Amino acid sequence: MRSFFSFLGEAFDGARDMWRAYSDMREANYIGSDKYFHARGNYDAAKRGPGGVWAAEAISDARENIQRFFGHGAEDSLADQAANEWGRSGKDPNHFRPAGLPEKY
Template sequence: MKLLLAVWFLQPLLSTLMDTQGFWETTWNAAKTPFRFGKEAYQGSRDMLRAYTDMRAANWKDSDKYFHARGNYDAAQRGPGGAWAAKHISNARERLDILRGRDPADSVADQEANNWGRSGGDPKRYRPRGLPPKY
């Protein structure tokens, strides 16, 4: 009798939890979100590093803006974590360049390319003529 009473009493609560698949799905997704963000940020950082190393390897005149846009674009395609990493890496790099005495106008132009790539714009807009297809 006590068991039947307990089942009868708990039945609305149990049915709500068991029938509401969205509850469990939402809980699971909320638990995964910080890890997903961190993974995206790490992958976005690698995208930025790859664009930088490609820029150094290419050593091509007027290719700076293209590699800025490409690195930010690739990182932002990873998701919010990648976009966050791209934004902070780009801003830190530009601040460092200004502290080193680089022309602020160049920094503004770089930031324009960074924002273009991060917002999903095609990096080819800044691609210089003759840059090898490898890049």
């Protein structure tokens, strides 16, 4: 049962990382930080393992869905995917860090 429960643990820790990215983005209320939190969320989940990568993909897709329900432009979403996959691929999320974002984020 090791890998069975391991993969589920990864997925739910990953889900937790994604929600924490969102939660931080909300708290930070910081202009131009969207892409950084997109990347950091996916990066964090991915680090958990295949379960996490899986969760990140599903949740990124869901967030894109909700975002345009509220009027997100199609080109904007694409730029967001780029950030998602950049972090999910394990590349440094700080690439998208806006000047002056507090270090706890």
